[PDB]
């Protein structure tokens, strides 16, 4: 029911160290708290403390995030629930690193084995493991799209033609969802098939350089895995359930004064910030029990509508930087992520 919200603080990066930035973030997984020194060079004691469902410090390894957050989600999907996990936070704090991850040097590991692997590569591997172990008759279908400047583009369409803006419509046979017309939904039979498709897909997800992040996501990435399951019980009863998992890598809050974003990059930041703002208003509207929730004001919240206050089991991974340089941005991330904890969802099997 209640949306699960966890926070992950990444390690200081080079630029922060070279700028002699100091640490203003303390994570306490035990108490499940994140405290932020809000004082300034003046006050070095005053702290702002938030309590979440789970808190991951700078030493948190990919596998830790997965075992703690994803594994339980994965089983729910197998149960026939609709689930969503999305990474949220300031540009450069670890959303993409967390959702997709990277690859260790010299092929010392296969994708699934890699300690740098993110949530998505691990989940595609695990999905088949659990399904084969389950015994059900199953079919797996995947899709990947990015929301770029309020337009939708399929990232898995293999065609050579330039990608067209996909149109979105409410699902006729389901008032709790949308339909992306023309979106490719590729049937996959094992991790190898999925991995080939995934790396090519994630590779073309619009990424560009900004002073804050040389590898900044210029769009919100939405990777969906739909699983059709059909089994026959010992009672000769045939049950058909459908599970779905949305792994979302959002673009992140960006102060163009700091990112130095110009024209095209600035245009992207404008859309990114506006869409995230709309996400914040949706969250706030749900926590305040407001008569209206502004889902329709952005393609992001339309896609995430059922995930936010609907019949989807949702988990949020708020990513933050430990540097004193990002006090306002960090507080903003923690504040909205904290509010999200109070949103009540009504998950139900399909
Ligand atoms: N937990 C971590 N451990 C090591 N490196 C990290 C970690 N988190 C983030 N990074 C690195 O910082 C750079 C990533 O920024 P990420 O790609 O993490 O930014 P982002 O949140 O996707 N930025 P943005 O797309 O603008 O919202 C990556 O090359 C990562 O390797
Ligand atoms: Mg990114």
Task: Domain ranges for the chain, please list them.
Answer: 1-350
User: Please, which residues bridge with residue 224 across strands?
Assistant: 143, 246
User: Please, which residues bridge with residue 269 across strands?
Assistant: none
Tokens encoding 281: 């208003």
Tell me which residue of 132, 131, 107, 111 sits closest to 121, measured CA to CA.
111
Tokens encoding 38: 């809000």
Residue with tokens 């300690």: 115
Residue with tokens 């992950």: 8
d(CA 6, CA 52): 6
| Atom of ligand 1 minimally distant from the CA of 319 | 21
Helix, strand, coil shares of the chain as percentages rounded to 5? Answer: 35, 30, 35
d(CA 204, CA 182): 18
Distance of alpha carbon 32 from the chain centroid: 20
d(CA 312, CA 342): 15
What count of other Cβ atoms lies within 10 Å of the Cβ of residue 58? 14
At residue 338's C-alpha, the angle toward residues 335 and 343, to 5°, is 130
d(CA 311, CA 145): 22
Let me know if 45 is exposed, middle or buried by CB neighbors in 10 A (0-12, 13-18, 19+): exposed
Pocket probe mutation, ligand 1, options 213, 251, 258, 326, max atoms within 8 Å of Cβ: 213
| Atom of ligand 1 minimally distant from the CA of 250 | 27
What count of other Cβ atoms lies within 10 Å of the Cβ of residue 15? 15
3-state secondary structure of 319: strand
Is 94 one of the annotated binding-site residues? yes
Tokens encoding 94: 């670890």
Tell me which residue of 229, 138, 222, 129 sits closest to 184, measured CA to CA.
222
At residue 111's C-alpha, the angle toward residues 119 and 307, to 5°, is 20
CATH 3.40.850.10 corresponds to the domain 1-350: yes
What count of other Cβ atoms lies within 10 Å of the Cβ of residue 265? 19
User: Please, which residues bridge with residue 86 across strands?
Assistant: 248, 316
**Rounded alpha-carbon distances, angstroms, from residue 2 to 78, 99, 312:** 20, 22, 10
What count of other Cβ atoms lies within 10 Å of the Cβ of residue 181? 10
What count of other Cβ atoms lies within 10 Å of the Cβ of residue 196? 11
Tell me which residue of 272, 266, 264, 166 sits closest to 217, measured CA to CA.
272
Phi, psi of 145, deg, nearest 5: -140, 160
Name, in order, each residue with C-beta under 8 angstroms of 51's C-beta and a sequence gap of 6 or more.
Answer: 31, 32, 33
Residue 215 CB less than 6 A away from ligand 1: yes
Is 182 one of the annotated binding-site residues? no
Q: Tell how far the Cα of 218 is from the centroid of ligand 2, in angstroms.
A: 7
What count of other Cβ atoms lies within 10 Å of the Cβ of residue 151? 15
DSSP 250-262: ------HHHH---
Q: Where are the alpha helices (DSSP H) in the chain?
A: 14-18, 62-65, 71-78, 95-99, 119-134, 191-204, 256-259, 263-287, 299-303, 327-341
Residue with tokens 């029990």: 289
Is 95 one of the annotated binding-site residues? yes
Q: Tell how far the Cα of 323 is from the centroid of ligand 1, in angstroms.
A: 14
Residue 11 CB less than 6 A away from ligand 1: yes
Residue with tokens 């930087």: 321
Phi, psi of 83, deg, nearest 5: -125, 150
CB 217 within 8 A of CB 95: yes
Identify the sign of the CA torsion 193, 198, 203, 206.
positive
Tell me which residue of 248, 156, 160, 266 sits closest to 202, measured CA to CA.
156
Among the bound ligands, name the one nearest to the CA of residue 211: 1
Query: Rounded to a whole number, what is the distance in angstroms from the first to the last CA of the chain?
Result: 16
Q: Tell how far the Cα of 223 is from the centroid of ligand 2, in angstroms.
A: 14
Is 91 one of the annotated binding-site residues? yes
CB 340 within 8 A of CB 6: no
72-78 contacts: CB < 8 A, separation 24 or more? 73/245, 73/313, 73/315, 74/123, 74/126, 74/127, 74/130, 74/245, 75/130, 76/243, 76/313, 76/347, 77/127, 77/225, 77/227, 77/243, 77/244, 77/245, 78/130, 78/131, 78/134, 78/227, 78/229, 78/243
Residue 307 CB less than 6 A away from ligand 1: no
């Amino acid at each position: 029911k209640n949306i699960q919200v966890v926070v992950r603080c990444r390690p200081f990066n080079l630029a922060e160290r070279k700028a002699s930035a100091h640490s203003i973030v303390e994570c306490d997984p035990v108490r499940k708290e994140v405290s932020v020194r809000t004082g300034g060079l003046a006050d070095k004691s005053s702290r702002k403390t938030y309590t979440f469902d789970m808190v991951f410090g700078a030493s948190t390894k990919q596998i830790d995030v997965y075992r703690s957050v994803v594994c339980p989600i994965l089983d729910e999907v197998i149960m026939g629930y609709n689930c969503t996990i999305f990474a949220y936070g300031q540009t450069g704090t670890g959303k993409t690193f967390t959702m997709e991850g990277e690859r260790s040097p010299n092929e010392e590991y296969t994708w699934e084995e890699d300690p740098l692997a993110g949530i998505i590569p691990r989940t595609l591997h695990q999905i088949f493991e659990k399904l084969t172990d389950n015994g059900t008759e199953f079919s797996v279908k995947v899709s990947l799209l990015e929301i770029y400047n309020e337009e939708l583009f399929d990232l898995l369409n293999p065609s050579s033609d330039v990608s067209e803006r996909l149109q979105m419509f409410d699902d006729p046979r389901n008032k709790r969802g949308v339909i992306i017309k023309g979106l490719e939904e590729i049937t996959v039979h094992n991790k190898d098939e999925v991995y080939q498709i995934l790396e090519k897909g994630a590779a073309k997800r619009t990424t560009a350089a900004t002073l804050m992040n040389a590898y900044s996501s210029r769009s919100h990435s939405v990777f969906s895995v739909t699983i059709h399951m059909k089994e026959t019980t010992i009672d000769g009863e045939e049950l058909v359930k459908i599970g779905k998992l949305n792994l979302v890598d959002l673009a992140g809050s960006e102060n163009i004064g700091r990112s130095g974003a110009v024209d095209k990059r600035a245009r992207e930041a404008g859309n990114i910030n506006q869409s995230l703002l709309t996400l914040g208003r949706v969250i706030t509207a749900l926590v305040e029990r407001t008569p209206h929730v502004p889902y329709r004001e952005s393609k992001l919240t339309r896609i995430l509508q059922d995930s936010l206050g609907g019949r989807t089991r949702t988990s949020i991974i708020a990513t933050i930087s430990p540097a004193s340089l990002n006090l306002e941005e960090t507080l903003s991330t923690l504040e909205y992520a904290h509010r999200a904890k109070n949103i009540l969802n009504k998950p139900e099997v399909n």
